[PDB]
């Protein structure tokens, strides 16, 4: 799949670096050296970015790599904001009182979105609920994050009058360190 493409792997622990290089080699890509050979076609970095000391082809995230392999398609890094480093105001937790459930998100995308929500202080629950329940251990949700009008959770947000917002809502919150105004990002206005 990745035949004739070359990669640097940067910013990871020793173990995770070796793991990502191996996935790359299975899809026919080649892995390069420190003080490096030639400029690599792609540099794979962590989701929040890191130092990129060499001129490189495209700075991409491990989220991009796994999504390309999962759908066996070479996605443009510009087609999804999680395929390139995500700006995060360090140390800011603007969602500390929020409870998020995601809809229409899968795989690596869902993993990364969950990482970001927790980093900003929100708690993420697989199930979307309107009333806390001590016995089943679920808390009422404050936000639905999704992609399209539609689905079980969409309808629930409408019945329960809870905001159902686009992914852009979370990325803008991360970028600024302040809770974005949900009312500028409603799924209903998309």
């Amino acid at each position: 799949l990745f035949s004739q493409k070359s990669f640097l792997v940067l910013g990871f622990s020793n173990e995770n670096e070796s793991n990502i290089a191996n996935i790359i080699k299975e899809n026919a890509g080649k892995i390069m050296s420190l003080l490096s050979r030639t400029v690599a076609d792609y540099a794979v970095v962590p989701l929040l970015g890191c130092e990129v000391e060499a001129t490189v082809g495209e700075v991409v995230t491990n989220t991009w790599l796994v999504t390309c392999i999962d759908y066996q398609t070479l996605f443009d890094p510009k087609s999804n904001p999680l395929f390139t480093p995500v700006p995060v105001m360090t140390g800011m937790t603007p969602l500390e009182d929020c409870v998020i459930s995601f809809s229409q998100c899968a795989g690596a995308e869902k993993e990364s979105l969950t990482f970001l929500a927790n980093l900003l202080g929100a708690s993420v629950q697989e199930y979307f609920v309107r009333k806390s329940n001590a016995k089943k251990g679920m808390f009422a949700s404050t936000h639905l994050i999704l992609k399209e009008r539609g689905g079980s959770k969409y309808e629930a947000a409408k019945k329960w009058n809870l905001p159902a917002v686009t992914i852009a809502w979370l990325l803008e919150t991360a970028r600024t360190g302040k809770r974005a105004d949900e009312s500028h990002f409603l799924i209903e206005n998309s």
Partner: peptide, 9 residues
């Protein structure tokens, strides 16, 4: 219910 289930996949 009061409780919407997973995205099963």
């Amino acid at each position: 219910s009061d409780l919407v289930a997973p995205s099963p996949d």
